[PDB]
Design an enzyme around this catalytic site. Structure first.
Site, PDB file in Angstrom:
ATOM      1  N   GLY A   1      15.163 -10.670  20.845  1.00  0.00           N
ATOM      2  CA  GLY A   1      14.940 -10.595  19.410  1.00  0.00           C
ATOM      3  C   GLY A   1      15.392  -9.255  18.863  1.00  0.00           C
ATOM      4  O   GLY A   1      16.056  -8.493  19.567  1.00  0.00           O
TER       5      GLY A   1
ATOM      6  N   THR B   1       5.210 -13.734  18.263  1.00  0.00           N
ATOM      7  CA  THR B   1       3.956 -14.474  18.229  1.00  0.00           C
ATOM      8  C   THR B   1       3.756 -15.047  16.835  1.00  0.00           C
ATOM      9  O   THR B   1       3.150 -14.404  15.976  1.00  0.00           O
ATOM     10  CB  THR B   1       2.753 -13.588  18.603  1.00  0.00           C
ATOM     11  OG1 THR B   1       2.445 -12.707  17.516  1.00  0.00           O
ATOM     12  CG2 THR B   1       3.068 -12.765  19.831  1.00  0.00           C
TER      13      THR B   1
ATOM     14  N   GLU C   1       6.469  -1.775  19.428  1.00  0.00           N
ATOM     15  CA  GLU C   1       7.592  -1.212  18.692  1.00  0.00           C
ATOM     16  C   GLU C   1       7.133  -0.589  17.383  1.00  0.00           C
ATOM     17  O   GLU C   1       6.061  -0.910  16.874  1.00  0.00           O
ATOM     18  CB  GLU C   1       8.646  -2.290  18.416  1.00  0.00           C
ATOM     19  CG  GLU C   1       8.084  -3.579  17.825  1.00  0.00           C
ATOM     20  CD  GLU C   1       7.979  -3.546  16.306  1.00  0.00           C
ATOM     21  OE1 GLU C   1       8.539  -2.619  15.682  1.00  0.00           O
ATOM     22  OE2 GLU C   1       7.330  -4.450  15.735  1.00  0.00           O
TER      23      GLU C   1
ATOM     24  N   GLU D   1      13.444  -2.490  10.421  1.00  0.00           N
ATOM     25  CA  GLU D   1      14.628  -3.338  10.388  1.00  0.00           C
ATOM     26  C   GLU D   1      15.665  -2.750   9.436  1.00  0.00           C
ATOM     27  O   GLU D   1      15.546  -2.879   8.218  1.00  0.00           O
ATOM     28  CB  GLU D   1      14.251  -4.758   9.956  1.00  0.00           C
ATOM     29  CG  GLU D   1      15.174  -5.850  10.470  1.00  0.00           C
ATOM     30  CD  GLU D   1      14.540  -7.227  10.383  1.00  0.00           C
ATOM     31  OE1 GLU D   1      13.306  -7.327  10.550  1.00  0.00           O
ATOM     32  OE2 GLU D   1      15.276  -8.207  10.141  1.00  0.00           O
TER      33      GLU D   1
ATOM     34  N   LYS E   1      -0.838  -0.721  16.274  1.00  0.00           N
ATOM     35  CA  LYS E   1       0.335  -1.321  15.649  1.00  0.00           C
ATOM     36  C   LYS E   1      -0.067  -2.128  14.414  1.00  0.00           C
ATOM     37  O   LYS E   1       0.608  -2.078  13.386  1.00  0.00           O
ATOM     38  CB  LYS E   1       1.090  -2.204  16.646  1.00  0.00           C
ATOM     39  CG  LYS E   1       2.261  -2.969  16.042  1.00  0.00           C
ATOM     40  CD  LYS E   1       3.238  -2.041  15.328  1.00  0.00           C
ATOM     41  CE  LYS E   1       4.423  -2.813  14.765  1.00  0.00           C
ATOM     42  NZ  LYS E   1       5.240  -1.984  13.835  1.00  0.00           N
TER      43      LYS E   1
ATOM     44  N   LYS F   1       5.923   3.629  -4.051  1.00  0.00           N
ATOM     45  CA  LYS F   1       6.768   3.098  -5.110  1.00  0.00           C
ATOM     46  C   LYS F   1       6.289   1.708  -5.491  1.00  0.00           C
ATOM     47  O   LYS F   1       6.436   0.753  -4.724  1.00  0.00           O
ATOM     48  CB  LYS F   1       8.236   3.076  -4.680  1.00  0.00           C
ATOM     49  CG  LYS F   1       8.807   4.464  -4.409  1.00  0.00           C
ATOM     50  CD  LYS F   1       8.422   5.436  -5.520  1.00  0.00           C
ATOM     51  CE  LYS F   1       8.363   6.872  -5.018  1.00  0.00           C
ATOM     52  NZ  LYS F   1       7.683   7.775  -5.992  1.00  0.00           N
TER      53      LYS F   1
ATOM     54  N   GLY G   1       7.133  -7.316   0.752  1.00  0.00           N
ATOM     55  CA  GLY G   1       7.575  -8.471   1.505  1.00  0.00           C
ATOM     56  C   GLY G   1       7.899  -8.067   2.926  1.00  0.00           C
ATOM     57  O   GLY G   1       7.553  -6.969   3.364  1.00  0.00           O
TER      58      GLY G   1
ATOM     59  N   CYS H   1       6.349  -8.652   8.529  1.00  0.00           N
ATOM     60  CA  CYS H   1       5.359  -7.886   9.277  1.00  0.00           C
ATOM     61  C   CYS H   1       4.104  -7.554   8.476  1.00  0.00           C
ATOM     62  O   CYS H   1       2.995  -7.703   8.979  1.00  0.00           O
ATOM     63  CB  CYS H   1       5.983  -6.587   9.801  1.00  0.00           C
ATOM     64  SG  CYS H   1       7.492  -6.808  10.778  1.00  0.00           S
TER      65      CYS H   1
ATOM     66  N   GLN I   1       2.345  -8.694   5.550  1.00  0.00           N
ATOM     67  CA  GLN I   1       1.327  -9.712   5.295  1.00  0.00           C
ATOM     68  C   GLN I   1       0.841 -10.349   6.597  1.00  0.00           C
ATOM     69  O   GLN I   1      -0.359 -10.554   6.785  1.00  0.00           O
ATOM     70  CB  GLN I   1       1.850 -10.798   4.355  1.00  0.00           C
ATOM     71  CG  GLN I   1       0.848 -11.931   4.136  1.00  0.00           C
ATOM     72  CD  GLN I   1       1.255 -12.883   3.029  1.00  0.00           C
ATOM     73  OE1 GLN I   1       1.274 -12.516   1.854  1.00  0.00           O
ATOM     74  NE2 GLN I   1       1.580 -14.116   3.400  1.00  0.00           N
TER      75      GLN I   1
END
Ligand SMILES: [Cl-]
Ligand SMILES: [Cl-]
Ligand SMILES: [Cl-]
Lengths: 461, 459, 130
Positions: A13, A91, A161, A165, A220, A267, A273, A276, A278
């Protein structure tokens, strides 16, 4: 003591792939094997064109692919040889059953654990790389214990991690911190230092953090929640700004100059969005409910409700400004991605704003410079309604031709550079611009004198 | 336009230190600090000041007599001033619409009417105290309604950000200076006039100019964002105790994210002070009044979580003592809301003690700095007489006690003789660490015979 | 604060369930200095209707309307007495604190709004946008 010589990663991934490519690039002596049951991805990794795009990734892979970096569909063999086994499968949120729409489904992780113990003998370190619910490593430890063999000593670690992105390679090469969680035992501590040693090849020891397994898993989730909370907090303030005459960008700046708070993630927007924020906050909330911590659960739930409020509020302003009727009215939607400079639309605020306006019977003309046409149609279905109301524009101006309002839902830089003089001429009057990303800040007086009524997040009308 | 004479109404811990510093960096400006309380003024003119701040005595002595004056002659000081600081405290309403949450503007209103009556020509009127939003509109309305020929009163917002204890240092090198003013030609002039005053010793990069409503709102939100950080990590602490995770470990891992930072992430029994709860509650009320119920209940969570954290902590003690505390001796170590101060305002020690008093406990309280009579006052509404004893030393408080409760992160508590304490404690002996001060000492204390529990750690 | 009219309606001394009682009581819960005037309602009745100590600190009873508006922030009309319409509001305004408010709870000053405004009053009433 124990040195890690061969590394297997299960899952190619956007997490496991780049992390291991970087490891291979900074650890030439270690044989890193990335495997996946999906024949699609593996062959793509072995191609001159990679299956995911990250700046500088193309270079990193090609430097190592063939020497100490390998991509294979041969999962079983890569496990047998490996000293360290990364579990890096996603997951997905459960779509049914106890915890529907919030709780994590551990099916892929459970499968990997059973796949590992079956195909492995001797000493191996098993490290979970994916974002998991807390006490997940307890589940992995339990499967190993239940399926023990003579001379099998499997160690379970957590190493989540923290790569954004878009800047994956930089985040890996120069991380804020590396997180490693392990059992508070001798065997566990050795396993921790084994992994710790791997990162020390290019990560300073000051920036490598060791915790117990549960602290690592939880960190995390909490880190992403704190980030999401920051956005929802400034967003709540944005609504209070529209009601007082205050300005959220001014307030955000003043707050952010406090060193104890900092100026990142302040900001205001139509709503956050991504795949990760929500997801992880909802997973956190569910976890608290399951552990009879209802006070904590509803504390963090507020981050989600506020984000939902921000979106609904924005859509309602549009509808109210258009005299509470939007039926058969042409409306331009500028920007569909959840943030600028990506084609990712997962949990994008653009989706919900659009859907609210569709429930009013609007004629939406959507434009996004990067987001694929077919993705937009998919994200707006469950069909017929999409056929009736949604048109997808090739250029911004085609979308604002005969429109009642211009709605900006993604902070693309190009929208700032539009010929609004041209757009206004062919818009129906009164012509509205709703800035949901504050991208037209500083252009207001211009746009007004042209003839626009312009409204934005966190500024009184 | 240059500012030459400054009048400040209110010699509190806000106006006093702020104006003394201004005088020190602006030798050409005549700064006059006034107050209707003759008591305060003479203290400022005394070798002994009415409030204690490090380096304040020095700054004051540099200017007092030359360009810094403390007087009861308010009317004349207003008449002479180009700039008038309103620096009176705005107490929470104790009755009526907004009881216990809304700010009472009475002292601000009095000051506004006093200014316009005693002033002519051009003057800049700046609010320095923590005020509710749209308060400057109230001041503007009094000025507009009570106008005179050739009266040009400008209203600015310039809130304080000094932590009580390191005021002077915060003033000399502030993170930022905040000034809010009207977005009009006349208004911008008043802003740049005040902006110019701070440029005497503050770099222009760290001076932020906003409109008046942004300035008022920024002071409240800033404290709220801070309070939210504590309540968030505290909420995590409860989740740590339930999972086996450790809140100090998690806090560290989170804080290393540059976007989050590592300040204000230390879990505790709950935050205290005269600013955090007051301002968050004031913020919540403001949202309710403006029909913003979603925002109101969003921020209310910061208060509920802090209340939860305290109640949770108290219940653990009671449960550990078999849900009966009647006539049991309990040592309370630390009463101040934070370490290294005598301030007890909204101290979590107050509530923890009160919860334990409602169980009929015999509390022996020790605090190294906090005055005895203050504790007795903070624990009343008869109940204090029966249950509360105030110990001169920690050991007097732990002599025959069932449990040791630490509610303030005093450094000295880390260094106590727990071997001695245990011998004369009743068994089983409990230590409840509400501030993580005994982190690293756990294995030690256990082998002595203590059961030790702390915030954000599974037992 | 001047309270003009205490009876539940005009031309009576009856205060039973009078809206004046509640308006006054709400303002008393804010700690106001109320100066109440009613041409017909007996003094002792007002004190009774405002009890259960609180009255002594906050309630002053004016013999004439002008004693109640001398240094007041606002004039509240709670009873549609005909006489309130005929007052010298030029005089009242001169000795009121600014900004000076009139809250008309009975629409008795309908038609007088422009007069009162140019004099300097801020005037608000039932069923009319401010
Ligand atoms: Cl429809
Ligand atoms: Cl005076
Ligand atoms: Cl009262």
């Amino acid at each position: 003591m124990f040195e890690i010589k061969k590394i297997c990663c299960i899952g190619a991934g956007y997490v496991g792939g780049p992390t291991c490519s970087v490891i291979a690039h900074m650890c030439p002596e270690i044989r890193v094997t990335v495997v996946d049951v999906n024949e699609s991805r593996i062959n793509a990794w072995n191609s001159p064109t990679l299956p995911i795009y990250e700046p500088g990734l193309k270079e990193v892979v090609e430097s190592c692919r063939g020497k100490n970096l390998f991509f294979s569909t041969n999962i079983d063999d890569a496990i047998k040889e490996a000293d360290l086994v990364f579990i890096s499968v996603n997951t997905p949120t459960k779509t049914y059953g106890m915890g529907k729409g919030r709780a994590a489904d551990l099916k892929y992780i459970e499968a990997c654990a059973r796949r590992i113990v079956q195909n492995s003998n001797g000493y191996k370190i098993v490290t979970e790389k994916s974002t998991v619910p807390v006490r997940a490593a307890e589940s992995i430890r339990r499967i190993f214990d239940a399926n023990t063999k003579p001379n099998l000593n499997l160690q379970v670690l957590s190493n989540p991690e923290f790569l954004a992105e878009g800047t994956a390679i930089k985040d890996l090469k120069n991380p804020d911190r590396v997180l490693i969680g392990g059992d508070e035992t001798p065997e566990g501590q050795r396993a921790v230092q084994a992994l710790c040693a791997v990162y020390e090849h290019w990560v300073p020891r000051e920036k490598i953090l060791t915790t117990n397994t549960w602290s690592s898993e939880l960190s995390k989730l909490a880190a992403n929640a704190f980030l999401a909370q920051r956005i929802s907090s400034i967003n709540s303030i944005s609504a209070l700004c529209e009601a007082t005459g205050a300005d959220v960008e001014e307030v955000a700046t003043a707050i952010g100059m406090d060193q104890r708070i900092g100026n990142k993630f302040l900001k205001a927007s139509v709503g956050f969005g991504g795949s990760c924020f929500q997801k992880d906050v909802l997973n956190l909330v569910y976890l608290c409910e399951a552990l009879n911590l209802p006070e904590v659960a509803r504390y963090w739930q507020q981050v989600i409700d506020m984000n939902d409020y921000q979106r609904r509020r924005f859509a309602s302003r549009i509808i109210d400004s258009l005299f509470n009727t939007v039926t058969d009215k042409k409306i331009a939607i500028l920007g569909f991605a959840f943030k600028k400079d990506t084609g990712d639309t997962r949990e994008s605020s653009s989706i919900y704003i659009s859907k609210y306006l569709m429930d009013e019977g609007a004629h939406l003309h959507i434009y996004d410079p990067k987001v694929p046409r077919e993705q937009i149609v998919v994200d707006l279905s469950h069909d017929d309604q999409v056929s009736r109301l949604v048109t997808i524009s090739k250029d911004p101006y085609e979308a604002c031709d005969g429109a009642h309002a211009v709605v900006i839902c993604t902070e693309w830089d190009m929208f700032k550079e539009l010929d609004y003089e041209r757009i206004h001429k062919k818009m129906l009057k009164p012509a509205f611009i709703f800035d949901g990303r504050r991208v037209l800040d500083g252009l207001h007086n211009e746009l007004q004198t042209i003839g626009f009524q312009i409204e934005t997040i966190g500024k009184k009308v």
